[PDB]
Amino acid sequence: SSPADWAKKLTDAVLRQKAGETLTAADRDFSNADFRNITFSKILPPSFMERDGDIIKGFNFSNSKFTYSDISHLHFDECRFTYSTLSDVVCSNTKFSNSDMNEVFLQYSITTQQQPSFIDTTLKNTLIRHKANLSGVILNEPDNSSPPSVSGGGNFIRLGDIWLQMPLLWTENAVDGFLNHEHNNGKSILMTIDSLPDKYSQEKVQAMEDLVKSLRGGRLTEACIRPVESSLVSVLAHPPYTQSALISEWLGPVQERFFAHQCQTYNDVPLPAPDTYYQQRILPVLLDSFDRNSAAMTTHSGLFNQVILHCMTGVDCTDGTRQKAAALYEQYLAHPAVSPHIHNGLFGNYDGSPDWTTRAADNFLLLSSQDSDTAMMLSTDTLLTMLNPTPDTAWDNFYLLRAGENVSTAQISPVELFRHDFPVFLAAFNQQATQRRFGELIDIILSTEEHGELNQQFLAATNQKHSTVKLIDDASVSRLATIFDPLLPEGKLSPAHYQHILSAYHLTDATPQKQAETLFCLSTAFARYSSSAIFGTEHDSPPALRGYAEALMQKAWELSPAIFPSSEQFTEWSDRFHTCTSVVADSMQRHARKYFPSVLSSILPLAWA
Amino acid sequence: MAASRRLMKELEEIRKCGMKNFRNIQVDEANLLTWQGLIVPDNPPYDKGAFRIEINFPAEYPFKPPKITFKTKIYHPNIDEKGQVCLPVISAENWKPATKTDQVIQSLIALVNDPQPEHPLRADLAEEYSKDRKKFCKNAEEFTKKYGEKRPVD
């Protein structure tokens, strides 16, 4: 019959099991079924789609033809799938347990948003989408079995005994898909392969050797690999991938370029408060890079002192990461550029070294950016809030050391000091009047009177690298557009709005350049706004917020084309404005910091830096 | 907190060198940011007695100075009739957090032993000092008796 009869024929078969009656050998045998294009929620109770619901236990769905069917949020137990076809299926957060799925097609739709799990499942010879939570799956030994079919047509790598498909060609799009698990809500082939249980380190490594050997033959350049630098190390820099010789060799240069790009970015600016992933997967690499570039500890003390601070107070930092840090720090304090400034009395445990148990000890020694003699001695509790300001954060709670000696800071303005010798805090000491100022522009785009929901939500999304709440749903399209479309007549920037933007930032009687650079930045912030990170998702992206982001960029160009890196780079940014939205958001920002970074940190949320 | 970490050490640092001038150090277990002490002048006309004293630390200590007040009436050119005293070291805009309080008190006691009518705080007594040391001492003497704390025996 049709699949509709296959449909209403399992509907009331697992309900008998949910009514007591056990099912014989013949009963629980739904082989050769066809459930194509059937949204399974409609003919199923609302319990199988709820957390801690019910399990479909003891079946035999061999040869099934699911292709196009949605099995979202459903948990199977003890079931057979051998020889099925699920390619193009929707399976958001699906789960399969103690059920064997050998030799099946699983290249599901890029449509699916959350990865499905596989607790105690087997995928012997199955084609998989490179994104999957295999945190329980027990793989098999690789059989002689021939490779999966194809028609020119890409090649496949082997992950223990599963089958993964490499792209036809590592276009920048192919790269940002398979590799970047940051721009993609934590999903990627690297995160997929490492999700395997902590013993298959043999096949896990092998699988990664096979993936580097793929990229090694991409011909792709330093320029094209940068936006996945952070995502690559975060996985490949920790054991067991440290043991693998072929993986260490290739990754070396990649980590030298990572550390380098981090030294340029966060040596002058507050490294944003770290989530857990960062504490666990990043810092350890930074501690490593510092341990190999000894000199770096002093020449880039600005960043060092951050990577250390955050290490010694990271809630989820391993006792190894803490020790390395502590130890890396006793090296830094003994440096002959640092140890002179140590007022043997008040510093640390008053016995020369830091007292890492207390957060209110003078454990930190900051070096001046300009002077050889000026240094700052301050505490962990204090350095913490200076770097992550609050409305009542005091900006002078530190011992100014002018060549070993302490000096009065009464009659020394903080602003002046941070400007000259300690650049790190200035982007932060400003945040109180930078936020208000930004707020005054969001209250202008989104009227408090009528719209208040969105408002506190746009405001909210500013103090977090990412947000759970998105706006790609249909009611948030009509909603948004009714607010942005009046500000963008003929796709250009409303002359009335622009004038408000000026008065908002006191740039009214400013120089055209300082204005261009500010619009450039606002355009950068509203770029961020419509990216997977904030209100967008991996494939969809709010059309208004992108049309406003591009519109702001326009007037920037209009005011001063010198601001932009080139005539043709403006073209290409404009085009991509019409996940390719988060690739410009960074590009614009990379540019923004290099040429007018003081104008940027006055507009961008310290939390986004 | 930091203020208490510092004070706990500032204190034992002072309970280390038993300078015979200042005793006994009391800290109110209500605040700890408020200390009492008793200064015992070496030079006349203040031997006849001694003087109690409260040292109140702001919460933002050590990054804002303390102020010292005399809880004992004292006839002195550099000391308010209400107890207030002006020390260069603990005045804001001259204060460095590193300053050891063992030395600010040393200062106060030095200012009580040898008054400096140079930049006084009480012209009344300051003119009497420079023009009539006999008389001034004759009055400070009797005022220490009448209003001053009892001289320590040990």
Side-chain angles (χ1 to χ4, degrees), chain A residues 1-4 6-7 10-11 13-17 19-20 23 25-34 36-37 39 41-43 45-50 53-64 66 68-69 72-94 96 98 100-110 112-123 125-136 140 142 144-154 156-161 163-171 173-201 203-212 214-242 244-315 317-343 345-350 352-369 371-380 382-415 417-435 437-448 451-455 457-464 466-489 491-539 541-578 580-581 583-609, chain B residues 1-7 9-14 17-19 21-28 30 32-41 43-47 49-53 55-80 83-92 94-99 101-113 115-117 120-123 125-126 128-133 136-137 139-141 143-145 147-154:
Chain A
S1 189
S2 267
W6 278 105
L10 182 52
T11 59
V14 75
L15 306 187
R16 294 191 186 189
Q17 275 188 324
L23 309 193
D27 308 32
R28 299 170 310 189
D29 231 287
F30 290 63
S31 295
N32 310 43
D34 175 338
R36 284 146 57 186
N37 193 28
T39 306
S41 71
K42 295 166 192 166
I43 63 171
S47 74
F48 290 104
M49 291 183 45
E50 277 174 346
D54 291 336
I55 55 186
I56 310 179
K57 190 169 83 72
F59 291 73
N60 189 341
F61 318 112
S62 302
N63 292 318
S64 318
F66 298 93
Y68 295 81
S69 69
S72 318
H73 309 271
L74 319 167
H75 179 211
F76 310 72
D77 186 327
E78 292 195 344
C79 317
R80 177 165 190 174
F81 280 87
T82 324
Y83 286 100
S84 305
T85 279
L86 305 73
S87 286
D88 285 19
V89 154
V90 165
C91 53
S92 289
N93 198 348
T94 307
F96 309 83
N98 306 37
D100 188 341
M101 314 179 58
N102 298 324
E103 269 129 340
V104 304
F105 283 97
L106 260 168
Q107 261 197 301
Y108 61 93
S109 184
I110 72 175
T112 310
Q113 290 202 290
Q114 190 180 356
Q115 300 174 195
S117 59
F118 299 93
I119 308 276
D120 288 334
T121 286
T122 53
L123 298 168
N125 285 26
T126 289
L127 203 181
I128 337 179
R129 178 168 166 60
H130 48 288
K131 306 178 169 184
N133 171 27
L134 318 165
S135 47
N140 281 312
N144 62 359
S145 27
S146 61
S149 191
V150 78
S151 184
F156 312 112
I157 77 181
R158 224 153 199 255
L159 162 42
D161 112 317
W163 277 96
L164 290 173
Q165 176 186 291
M166 303 290 87
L168 242 64
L169 185 273
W170 300 98
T171 51
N173 171 246
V175 165
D176 191 277
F178 286 77
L179 284 186
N180 205 329
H181 48 210
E182 284 169 354
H183 302 170
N184 288 30
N185 268 116
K187 316 184 311 174
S188 73
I189 197 156
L190 297 159
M191 277 295 175
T192 288
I193 303 173
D194 206 43
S195 75
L196 294 178
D198 262 337
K199 62 178 179 175
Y200 293 132
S201 59
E203 288 77 22
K204 299 174 70 176
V205 162
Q206 179 89 301
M208 284 293 182
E209 289 173 358
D210 305 354
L211 184 77
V212 170
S214 155
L215 290 150
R216 195 191 305 152
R219 282 288 204 76
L220 65 197
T221 189
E222 289 190 340
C224 179
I225 214 174
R226 187 183 181 172
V228 276
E229 286 179 341
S230 198
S231 334
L232 281 160
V233 281
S234 98
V235 174
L236 292 177
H238 308 63
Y241 308 84
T242 67
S244 150
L246 299 125
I247 292 182
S248 325
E249 174 195 90
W250 186 81
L251 167 148
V254 184
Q255 188 181 319
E256 290 191 322
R257 294 202 293 271
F258 176 70
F259 183 73
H261 290 144
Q262 303 297 332
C263 291
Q264 310 171 6
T265 305
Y266 298 122
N267 189 79
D268 283 320
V269 190
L271 189 46
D275 71 49
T276 271
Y277 157 104
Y278 197 90
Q279 296 185 8
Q280 293 186 320
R281 291 187 172 277
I282 301 296
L283 298 181
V285 178
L286 281 185
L287 280 183
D288 196 42
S289 299
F290 265 112
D291 194 31
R292 301 183 169 188
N293 299 262
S294 163
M297 287 188 323
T298 20
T299 70
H300 292 75
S301 74
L303 171 66
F304 182 54
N305 281 302
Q306 302 190 70
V307 181
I308 288 297
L309 161 58
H310 283 295
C311 264
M312 298 306 304
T313 60
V315 211
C317 294
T318 35
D319 251 329
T321 285
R322 308 174 56 62
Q323 288 174 331
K324 195 155 192 53
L328 241 197
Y329 207 77
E330 312 288 316
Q331 298 186 14
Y332 165 80
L333 280 178
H335 201 262
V338 164
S339 75
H341 299 87
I342 287 185
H343 191 278
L346 290 180
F347 174 84
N349 56 16
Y350 320 107
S353 32
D355 180 343
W356 286 121
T357 46
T358 86
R359 293 212 161 175
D362 306 274
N363 292 326
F364 287 102
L365 203 288
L366 274 30
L367 294 178
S368 168
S369 215
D371 218 326
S372 311
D373 301 21
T374 290
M376 178 187 284
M377 180 173 68
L378 82 168
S379 83
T380 312
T382 292
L383 175 75
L384 265 182
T385 21
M386 261 156 95
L387 287 175
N388 192 22
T390 226
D392 285 41
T393 289
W395 300 89
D396 65 14
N397 291 13
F398 58 88
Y399 302 83
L400 234 196
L401 292 166
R402 192 76 177 104
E405 289 296 61
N406 175 58
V407 179
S408 180
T409 59
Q411 291 160 352
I412 286 191
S413 165
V415 196
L417 187 49
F418 299 171
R419 184 170 298 119
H420 187 6
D421 290 320
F422 306 107
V424 200
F425 313 110
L426 94 190
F429 160 72
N430 295 330
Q431 286 306 295
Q432 179 230 273
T434 274
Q435 290 186 31
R437 192 124 47 176
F438 181 89
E440 298 178 20
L441 163 144
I442 285 216
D443 285 332
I444 278 295
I445 305 184
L446 302 185
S447 306
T448 168
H451 313 68
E453 177 207 345
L454 282 174
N455 184 285
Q457 272 185 318
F458 256 97
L459 272 309
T462 72
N463 28 46
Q464 42 178 186
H466 352 82
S467 185
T468 52
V469 179
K470 314 295 177 176
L471 303 173
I472 62 177
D473 101 271
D474 309 271
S476 287
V477 190
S478 165
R479 174 79 76 174
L480 289 173
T482 315
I483 336 180
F484 277 109
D485 293 39
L487 302 184
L488 297 174
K492 283 201 246 71
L493 184 56
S494 170
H497 189 69
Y498 173 60
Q499 290 303 333
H500 274 63
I501 285 191
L502 287 179
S503 52
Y505 281 95
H506 301 87
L507 294 174
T508 356
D509 252 324
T511 164
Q513 176 173 310
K514 208 172 186 165
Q515 296 186 315
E517 298 169 352
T518 309
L519 279 162
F520 193 97
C521 291
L522 302 171
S523 168
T524 285
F526 280 84
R528 190 134 305 305
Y529 260 144
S530 53
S531 74
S532 54
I534 310 298
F535 291 119
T537 63
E538 317 158 31
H539 279 88
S541 188
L545 291 167
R546 293 204 279 109
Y548 185 60
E550 188 262 351
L552 290 178
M553 192 175 80
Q554 260 288 353
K555 183 73 77 195
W557 176 259
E558 235 148 86
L559 292 204
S560 173
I563 299 320
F564 296 68
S566 87
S567 172
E568 296 307 301
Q569 176 73 283
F570 166 71
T571 295
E572 186 181 353
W573 283 354
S574 178
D575 299 343
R576 267 214 286 276
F577 254 140
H578 305 308
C580 34
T581 178
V583 182
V584 290
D586 304 349
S587 217
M588 283 174 73
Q589 191 168 351
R590 229 170 293 125
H591 189 251
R593 181 193 53 251
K594 194 192 273 286
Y595 293 117
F596 41 88
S598 45
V599 188
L600 179 64
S601 58
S602 56
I603 280 75
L604 269 174
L606 195 144
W608 280 1
Chain B
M1 250 306 196
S4 58
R5 168 180 181 94
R6 173 71 188 261
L7 295 176
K9 168 190 163 187
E10 284 285 31
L11 216 171
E12 75 182 16
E13 293 260 71
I14 226 170
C17 65
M19 56 185 92
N21 306 119
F22 206 58
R23 47 181 315 196
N24 57 5
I25 331 292
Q26 278 169 346
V27 50
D28 292 29
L32 167 68
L33 287 162
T34 56
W35 294 7
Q36 221 116 0
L38 188 236
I39 78 197
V40 174
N43 289 319
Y46 304 108
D47 328 311
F51 306 80
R52 214 167 18 90
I53 265 176
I55 309 174
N56 317 273
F57 296 91
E60 42 284 334
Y61 182 82
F63 306 114
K64 237 185 162 187
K67 69 241 300 185
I68 310 159
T69 317
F70 274 75
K71 299 299 189 185
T72 300
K73 306 237 169 191
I74 182 178
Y75 194 96
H76 195 305
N78 296 90
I79 307 176
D80 244 27
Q84 288 288 3
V85 151
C86 185
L87 288 193
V89 46
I90 74 155
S91 62
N94 222 30
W95 166 263
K96 33 200 182 192
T99 83
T101 67
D102 330 86
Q103 296 177 0
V104 343
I105 290 185
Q106 206 187 270
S107 320
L108 204 176
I109 297 176
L111 181 56
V112 155
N113 277 325
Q116 55 178 6
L121 169 64
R122 206 178 207 254
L125 304 188
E128 184 175 43
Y129 186 80
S130 317
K131 306 283 193 50
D132 227 275
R133 273 247 193 90
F136 167 88
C137 290
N139 296 323
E141 188 108 353
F143 198 59
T144 308
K145 282 207 58 182
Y147 294 73
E149 216 79 26
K150 220 98 231 310
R151 245 299 171 123
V153 194
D154 311 319

mmCIF file of all heavy atoms in Angstrom, chain A residues 345-346 348 350 358 360 397-399 406 408 410-411, chain B residues 1-2 5-6 9 62-63 93-98, unseen atoms left out:
data_model
loop_
_atom_site.group_PDB
_atom_site.id
_atom_site.type_symbol
_atom_site.label_atom_id
_atom_site.label_comp_id
_atom_site.label_asym_id
_atom_site.label_seq_id
_atom_site.Cartn_x
_atom_site.Cartn_y
_atom_site.Cartn_z
ATOM 1 N N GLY A 345 57.626 43.872 49.696
ATOM 2 C CA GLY A 345 56.708 43.884 50.819
ATOM 3 C C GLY A 345 55.302 43.431 50.479
ATOM 4 O O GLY A 345 54.881 42.341 50.860
ATOM 5 N N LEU A 346 54.580 44.268 49.745
ATOM 6 C CA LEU A 346 53.151 44.079 49.530
ATOM 7 C C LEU A 346 52.760 43.010 48.510
ATOM 8 O O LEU A 346 51.648 42.480 48.569
ATOM 9 C CB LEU A 346 52.510 45.405 49.134
ATOM 10 C CG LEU A 346 52.431 46.455 50.240
ATOM 11 C CD1 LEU A 346 51.783 47.728 49.717
ATOM 12 C CD2 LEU A 346 51.661 45.914 51.441
ATOM 13 N N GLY A 348 52.149 39.680 46.254
ATOM 14 C CA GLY A 348 51.920 38.257 46.440
ATOM 15 C C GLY A 348 51.731 37.863 47.889
ATOM 16 O O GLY A 348 50.960 38.491 48.610
ATOM 17 N N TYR A 350 53.830 38.252 50.162
ATOM 18 C CA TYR A 350 54.808 39.040 50.896
ATOM 19 C C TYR A 350 56.138 38.320 50.998
ATOM 20 O O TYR A 350 57.044 38.773 51.698
ATOM 21 C CB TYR A 350 54.322 39.336 52.308
ATOM 22 C CG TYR A 350 52.854 39.662 52.443
ATOM 23 C CD1 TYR A 350 51.977 38.746 53.008
ATOM 24 C CD2 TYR A 350 52.350 40.889 52.044
ATOM 25 C CE1 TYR A 350 50.641 39.033 53.157
ATOM 26 C CE2 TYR A 350 51.014 41.186 52.190
ATOM 27 C CZ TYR A 350 50.162 40.250 52.749
ATOM 28 O OH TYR A 350 48.823 40.522 52.901
ATOM 29 N N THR A 358 43.973 32.885 47.365
ATOM 30 C CA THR A 358 43.121 34.044 47.580
ATOM 31 C C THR A 358 42.931 34.807 46.278
ATOM 32 O O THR A 358 43.838 34.879 45.448
ATOM 33 C CB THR A 358 43.720 35.005 48.622
ATOM 34 O OG1 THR A 358 44.631 35.901 47.978
ATOM 35 C CG2 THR A 358 44.456 34.239 49.717
ATOM 36 N N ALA A 360 42.056 37.970 46.474
ATOM 37 C CA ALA A 360 42.255 39.357 46.867
ATOM 38 C C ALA A 360 43.702 39.628 47.243
ATOM 39 O O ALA A 360 43.982 40.467 48.101
ATOM 40 C CB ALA A 360 41.320 39.734 48.006
ATOM 41 N N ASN A 397 42.137 51.346 41.989
ATOM 42 C CA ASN A 397 42.514 50.400 43.033
ATOM 43 C C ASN A 397 43.734 49.561 42.678
ATOM 44 O O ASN A 397 43.646 48.338 42.547
ATOM 45 C CB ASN A 397 41.329 49.506 43.391
ATOM 46 C CG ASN A 397 40.232 50.270 44.090
ATOM 47 O OD1 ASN A 397 40.235 51.505 44.105
ATOM 48 N ND2 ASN A 397 39.288 49.548 44.680
ATOM 49 N N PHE A 398 44.870 50.235 42.530
ATOM 50 C CA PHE A 398 46.119 49.573 42.188
ATOM 51 C C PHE A 398 47.327 50.395 42.596
ATOM 52 O O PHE A 398 47.268 51.621 42.709
ATOM 53 C CB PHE A 398 46.185 49.289 40.690
ATOM 54 C CG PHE A 398 46.059 50.516 39.839
ATOM 55 C CD1 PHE A 398 47.179 51.263 39.505
ATOM 56 C CD2 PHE A 398 44.821 50.925 39.371
ATOM 57 C CE1 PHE A 398 47.062 52.397 38.720
ATOM 58 C CE2 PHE A 398 44.698 52.052 38.589
ATOM 59 C CZ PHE A 398 45.818 52.791 38.263
ATOM 60 N N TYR A 399 48.435 49.703 42.811
ATOM 61 C CA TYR A 399 49.676 50.365 43.152
ATOM 62 C C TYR A 399 50.405 50.766 41.880
ATOM 63 O O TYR A 399 50.887 49.910 41.135
ATOM 64 C CB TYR A 399 50.552 49.429 43.979
ATOM 65 C CG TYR A 399 49.906 48.937 45.255
ATOM 66 C CD1 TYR A 399 49.041 47.855 45.244
ATOM 67 C CD2 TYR A 399 50.181 49.545 46.474
ATOM 68 C CE1 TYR A 399 48.463 47.394 46.411
ATOM 69 C CE2 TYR A 399 49.606 49.093 47.646
ATOM 70 C CZ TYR A 399 48.748 48.014 47.610
ATOM 71 O OH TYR A 399 48.172 47.556 48.775
ATOM 72 N N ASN A 406 56.427 52.971 44.703
ATOM 73 C CA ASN A 406 55.013 53.291 44.577
ATOM 74 C C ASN A 406 54.765 54.792 44.559
ATOM 75 O O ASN A 406 55.424 55.545 45.271
ATOM 76 C CB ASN A 406 54.189 52.616 45.675
ATOM 77 C CG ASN A 406 52.725 53.031 45.647
ATOM 78 O OD1 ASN A 406 52.027 52.851 44.639
ATOM 79 N ND2 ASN A 406 52.249 53.579 46.761
ATOM 80 N N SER A 408 51.715 58.146 44.142
ATOM 81 C CA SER A 408 50.326 58.541 44.366
ATOM 82 C C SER A 408 49.522 58.672 43.073
ATOM 83 O O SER A 408 49.975 59.300 42.122
ATOM 84 C CB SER A 408 50.260 59.862 45.129
ATOM 85 O OG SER A 408 48.908 60.248 45.340
ATOM 86 N N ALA A 410 46.356 59.913 43.171
ATOM 87 C CA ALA A 410 45.511 61.086 43.358
ATOM 88 C C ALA A 410 46.146 62.235 42.596
ATOM 89 O O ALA A 410 47.283 62.609 42.872
ATOM 90 C CB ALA A 410 45.383 61.426 44.831
ATOM 91 N N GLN A 411 45.412 62.779 41.630
ATOM 92 C CA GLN A 411 45.935 63.797 40.715
ATOM 93 C C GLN A 411 46.574 63.149 39.487
ATOM 94 O O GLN A 411 47.351 63.772 38.764
ATOM 95 C CB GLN A 411 46.911 64.752 41.414
ATOM 96 C CG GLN A 411 46.256 65.669 42.444
ATOM 97 C CD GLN A 411 47.252 66.236 43.440
ATOM 98 O OE1 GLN A 411 48.419 65.842 43.463
ATOM 99 N NE2 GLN A 411 46.792 67.164 44.275
ATOM 100 N N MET B 1 37.724 40.161 51.472
ATOM 101 C CA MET B 1 37.977 41.468 50.873
ATOM 102 C C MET B 1 39.438 41.871 51.004
ATOM 103 O O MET B 1 40.191 41.276 51.768
ATOM 104 C CB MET B 1 37.088 42.542 51.502
ATOM 105 C CG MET B 1 35.994 43.075 50.580
ATOM 106 S SD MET B 1 36.595 43.693 48.987
ATOM 107 C CE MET B 1 35.169 44.633 48.442
ATOM 108 N N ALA B 2 39.828 42.896 50.257
ATOM 109 C CA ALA B 2 41.213 43.350 50.251
ATOM 110 C C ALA B 2 41.546 44.203 51.473
ATOM 111 O O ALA B 2 42.594 44.028 52.090
ATOM 112 C CB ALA B 2 41.516 44.112 48.969
ATOM 113 N N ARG B 5 42.428 42.129 54.397
ATOM 114 C CA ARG B 5 43.695 41.424 54.206
ATOM 115 C C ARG B 5 44.878 42.327 54.544
ATOM 116 O O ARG B 5 45.840 41.910 55.201
ATOM 117 C CB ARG B 5 43.846 40.930 52.767
ATOM 118 C CG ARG B 5 45.257 40.447 52.466
ATOM 119 C CD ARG B 5 45.412 39.961 51.050
ATOM 120 N NE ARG B 5 46.771 39.493 50.805
ATOM 121 C CZ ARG B 5 47.152 38.226 50.927
ATOM 122 N NH1 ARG B 5 46.266 37.307 51.286
ATOM 123 N NH2 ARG B 5 48.410 37.874 50.686
ATOM 124 N N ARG B 6 44.792 43.565 54.074
ATOM 125 C CA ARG B 6 45.839 44.553 54.268
ATOM 126 C C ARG B 6 45.914 44.938 55.739
ATOM 127 O O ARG B 6 46.985 44.928 56.338
ATOM 128 C CB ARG B 6 45.554 45.775 53.386
ATOM 129 C CG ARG B 6 46.461 46.964 53.602
ATOM 130 C CD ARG B 6 47.862 46.715 53.095
ATOM 131 N NE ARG B 6 48.740 47.814 53.485
ATOM 132 C CZ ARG B 6 49.088 48.817 52.686
ATOM 133 N NH1 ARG B 6 48.643 48.849 51.437
ATOM 134 N NH2 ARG B 6 49.887 49.778 53.133
ATOM 135 N N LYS B 9 47.535 42.660 58.206
ATOM 136 C CA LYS B 9 48.992 42.721 58.177
ATOM 137 C C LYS B 9 49.528 44.048 58.690
ATOM 138 O O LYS B 9 50.479 44.073 59.462
ATOM 139 C CB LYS B 9 49.532 42.479 56.775
ATOM 140 C CG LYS B 9 51.007 42.826 56.658
ATOM 141 C CD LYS B 9 51.470 42.826 55.213
ATOM 142 C CE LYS B 9 52.797 43.549 55.059
ATOM 143 N NZ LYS B 9 53.170 43.694 53.628
ATOM 144 N N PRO B 62 43.282 50.060 50.870
ATOM 145 C CA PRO B 62 44.292 51.097 51.091
ATOM 146 C C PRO B 62 44.374 52.165 50.003
ATOM 147 O O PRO B 62 45.372 52.888 49.947
ATOM 148 C CB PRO B 62 45.588 50.291 51.099
ATOM 149 C CG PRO B 62 45.324 49.195 50.124
ATOM 150 C CD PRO B 62 43.864 48.858 50.248
ATOM 151 N N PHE B 63 43.353 52.282 49.164
ATOM 152 C CA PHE B 63 43.426 53.218 48.047
ATOM 153 C C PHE B 63 42.754 54.556 48.328
ATOM 154 O O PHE B 63 42.362 55.277 47.410
ATOM 155 C CB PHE B 63 42.854 52.572 46.804
ATOM 156 C CG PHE B 63 43.489 51.263 46.482
ATOM 157 C CD1 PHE B 63 42.761 50.093 46.542
ATOM 158 C CD2 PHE B 63 44.827 51.203 46.135
ATOM 159 C CE1 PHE B 63 43.352 48.893 46.249
ATOM 160 C CE2 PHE B 63 45.424 50.008 45.840
ATOM 161 C CZ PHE B 63 44.691 48.851 45.897
ATOM 162 N N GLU B 93 45.510 63.239 47.878
ATOM 163 C CA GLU B 93 46.353 63.992 46.941
ATOM 164 C C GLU B 93 47.818 64.071 47.382
ATOM 165 O O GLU B 93 48.574 64.920 46.915
ATOM 166 C CB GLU B 93 45.795 65.404 46.713
ATOM 167 N N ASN B 94 48.201 63.173 48.282
ATOM 168 C CA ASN B 94 49.561 63.091 48.798
ATOM 169 C C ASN B 94 49.757 61.653 49.259
ATOM 170 O O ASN B 94 50.835 61.257 49.698
ATOM 171 C CB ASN B 94 49.735 64.050 49.984
ATOM 172 C CG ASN B 94 51.055 64.801 49.949
ATOM 173 O OD1 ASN B 94 51.597 65.075 48.880
ATOM 174 N ND2 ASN B 94 51.577 65.140 51.124
ATOM 175 N N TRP B 95 48.688 60.873 49.138
ATOM 176 C CA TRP B 95 48.614 59.529 49.700
ATOM 177 C C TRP B 95 48.948 58.435 48.691
ATOM 178 O O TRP B 95 48.346 58.359 47.617
ATOM 179 C CB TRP B 95 47.212 59.302 50.283
ATOM 180 C CG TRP B 95 46.880 57.878 50.595
ATOM 181 C CD1 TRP B 95 46.191 57.005 49.805
ATOM 182 C CD2 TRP B 95 47.205 57.164 51.793
ATOM 183 N NE1 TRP B 95 46.072 55.787 50.430
ATOM 184 C CE2 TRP B 95 46.688 55.858 51.653
ATOM 185 C CE3 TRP B 95 47.883 57.499 52.968
ATOM 186 C CZ2 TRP B 95 46.831 54.889 52.645
ATOM 187 C CZ3 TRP B 95 48.023 56.539 53.950
ATOM 188 C CH2 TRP B 95 47.500 55.249 53.783
ATOM 189 N N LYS B 96 49.918 57.594 49.042
ATOM 190 C CA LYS B 96 50.224 56.397 48.262
ATOM 191 C C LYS B 96 49.897 55.146 49.066
ATOM 192 O O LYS B 96 50.318 55.016 50.211
ATOM 193 C CB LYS B 96 51.681 56.394 47.775
ATOM 194 C CG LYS B 96 52.673 57.046 48.710
ATOM 195 C CD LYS B 96 53.956 57.428 47.977
ATOM 196 C CE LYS B 96 54.989 58.034 48.932
ATOM 197 N NZ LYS B 96 56.147 58.680 48.229
ATOM 198 N N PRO B 97 49.134 54.223 48.464
ATOM 199 C CA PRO B 97 48.621 53.035 49.154
ATOM 200 C C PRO B 97 49.719 52.241 49.859
ATOM 201 O O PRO B 97 49.440 51.539 50.832
ATOM 202 C CB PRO B 97 48.006 52.206 48.019
ATOM 203 C CG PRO B 97 48.634 52.728 46.779
ATOM 204 C CD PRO B 97 48.829 54.189 47.026
ATOM 205 N N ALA B 98 50.953 52.362 49.382
ATOM 206 C CA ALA B 98 52.070 51.639 49.980
ATOM 207 C C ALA B 98 52.482 52.140 51.374
ATOM 208 O O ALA B 98 53.202 51.439 52.078
ATOM 209 C CB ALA B 98 53.267 51.646 49.040
#
